[PDB]
Write a protein that binds this ligand. Sequence first.
Ligand SMILES: CNCc1ccc2c(c1)c1ccccc1n2CC(F)F
Ligand SMILES: [Zn+2]
Length: 196
Amino acid sequence: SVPSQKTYQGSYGFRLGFLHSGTAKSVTCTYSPALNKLFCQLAKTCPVQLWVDSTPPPGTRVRAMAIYKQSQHMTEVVRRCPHHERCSDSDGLAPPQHLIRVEGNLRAEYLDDRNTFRHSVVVPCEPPEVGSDCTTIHYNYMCYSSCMGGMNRRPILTIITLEDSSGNLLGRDSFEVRVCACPGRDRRTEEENLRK
Ligand SMILES: CNCc1ccc2c(c1)c1ccccc1n2CC(F)F
Ligand SMILES: [Zn+2]
């Protein structure tokens, strides 16, 4: 009824990482460690790093799913709003209803869960390129937090799960997301609010 959001490193030491993009007015994606919250513009690249302490088995996958953060909305499926689901911005692979897309990965698979109706996107877990210490997935969020008839100003969390080839849990991490026109200003505002 509600997916778990419990952080779980598991046997492989799985956890996320984020770049340090700053809060300039021109920034398109920026992560707040103090808030555990990503702020991003609509349909812009969101780099999320995947870190492990040891190599998981061949066939391991990485899934992303959004849920509402507030308990009174958590059973409602997070989906694109009535406008954006109809705006014909398909990449040829993501269903138009899905909020979260993976950019530039032809092996991405999009699931409409037959029992919960929730959306998710899953990719094979690949090792870092030679010379790199982590792997990066590029996500896009395809509606604003404010979209009426969709998220409607309700905060969401993205849950990232490391899964075996059957879909069993190997690791889990999560972060809040706000999709907004000015992520740098909004991060600054929310960090100052938290500090006060
Ligand atoms: C020093 N660098 C460690 C590191 C970090 C991330 C890594 C791996 C190794 C690794 C090895 C095999 C397959 C996937 C791997 N990942 C992606 C996984 F975190 F999602
Ligand atoms: Zn929308």
